[PDB]
Structures are given as C-alpha cells and as structure tokens.
Amino acid sequence: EVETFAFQAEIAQLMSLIINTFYSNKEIFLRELISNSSDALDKIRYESLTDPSKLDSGKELHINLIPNKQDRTLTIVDTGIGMTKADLINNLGTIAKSGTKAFMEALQAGADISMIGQFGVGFYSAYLVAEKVTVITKHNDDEQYAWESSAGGSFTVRTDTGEPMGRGTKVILHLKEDQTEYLEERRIKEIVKKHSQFIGYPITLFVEK
C-alpha cells in the first residue's frame, strides 16, 4: 500500500532550483545531512534526560556513513529521534515552506546554495548528488516508514517491510551517474574532516569488500 503525495509548490520549486542551477560545490550535501542527524540525536538525548525509557529502542547515539558501489548508494544512518508518518508528510519535520521563502530571497540577495542549512531546508541539498532519495525512519511513537522521491513534484510514503531499525533515520542517496566520487573512502573522509569535524557524535565510515 503506497500513498503518493504532491510536494507543496514552493518545495517543488526549491528542488528544481537545486537540480537545475549550475553550482559546483556539491559536497556540502553531506555536511547538511550529518548536521540534520546531529540535530535528531540531540532531540532524543534531551528527551532521555527526563525519561530514560526513551532509549529502550536503542541506547547508542551515532552516525554511520555506508557507501555501496554495487548499488551506487550512499546511506547516512543515525539513531536520533526519528520521524512519525505525519513528520514525513510534513516535509520531513521541517518548516520547508517558510524556509524556502527565506532561502530564495537570500539567493537573489548575494547568498549561495551552500548556505541552505541556515534556512532549515538542508535535507533537499541531497538532490545535488542524488537522482532518488529514500528515507527510512522509526520514531518511538509510530511505526517504521519509507519516504521516497525522484523529484518531479511527488513523493511516496509506505510502511517499511525492510530491516527493523529500532529508532532513527536512514537517508539512502541513489547517486547520479557522474557523482560516484562520493562513494570513495578518501573523498568521504576529506568532506567529513573539512565540514563536520565538531559534530558531537561518532561518525563511522564503513568500508567495502
């Protein structure tokens, strides 16, 4: 059972700008997704300070980066607070309508795409490098769901029958053919060191056979 939704017009416009604008500094997508994971880990940590049972779904707070050259995917896994189905539908827990408005005003006022995270819509920078994005998520108060979009104005949501997650979010980037450098270990390491050196959770870069 798969539900198909239209993006709000402003979000579809944001996605088309990210996909169509000539902009060489694509590597910032990874900083933005790691920052989002850190924010989600902060949220479950704060909740756990007054209710330790919030971590019954997993005590470890971490970020894993998993490249797969055979599938041409880069997956960012975190054990943060996760998202409910309602969160997924509501622009993956963001205030994307107002954030997009502020971002596009900044772009015509000097700013560049790399500042996207300052407007709360950094997730969508995934489309700098991915032709399709799948988001698997599990929040303590809901079931496990899969969100997916190849842009083009729509996204899908379905209950996820895949591997149970416990709690958190997996962002699966199905990379564009010409963006496979982001599967190479030395390139990922360079980006993490350059942009994510102060993230307060362990970031483990998995290696491949």
Ligand X SMILES: CC1(C)C(=O)Nc2ccc(Br)cc21
Which parts are annotated binding residues for ATP?
36, 78, 97, 123
Give the per-residue contact string, 30-49, with ligand X (x = CB under 6 A; - = no): ---x--xx--x---------
Whole-angstrom Cα distance, residue 132 to residue 168?
A: 20
Torsion of CA 108, 96, 10, 139, to 10 degrees: 150
Among 27, 78, 148, 160, the residue binding ligand X under the rule CB under 6 A is: 78
Return the number of the residue (74 or 171) whose C-beta is nearest ligand X.
171
Give the per-residue contact string, 138-177, with ligand X (x = CB under 6 A; - = no): -------------------------------x-x------
Closest approach of ligand X to the CB of residue 38, in Å:
9
Q: Which residues pair with 205 in a beta bridge?
A: 65
Residues annotated within the binding site are: 36, 78, 97, 123
Among 31, 79, 82, 140, the residue binding ligand X under the rule CB under 6 A is: 82
The pairing of strands 145-149 and 73-78 is unpaired
Q: Half-sphere exposure of residue 114, counting CA atoms within 13 Å on the CB side? A: 8
Local structure of 63: helix, strand or coil: strand
Distances from the Cα of 183 to the Cα of 73, 94, 128, angstroms: 8, 27, 15
Q: Which residues bind ligand X (CB under 6 A)?
A: 33, 36-37, 40, 78, 80-83, 92-93, 123, 135, 169, 171
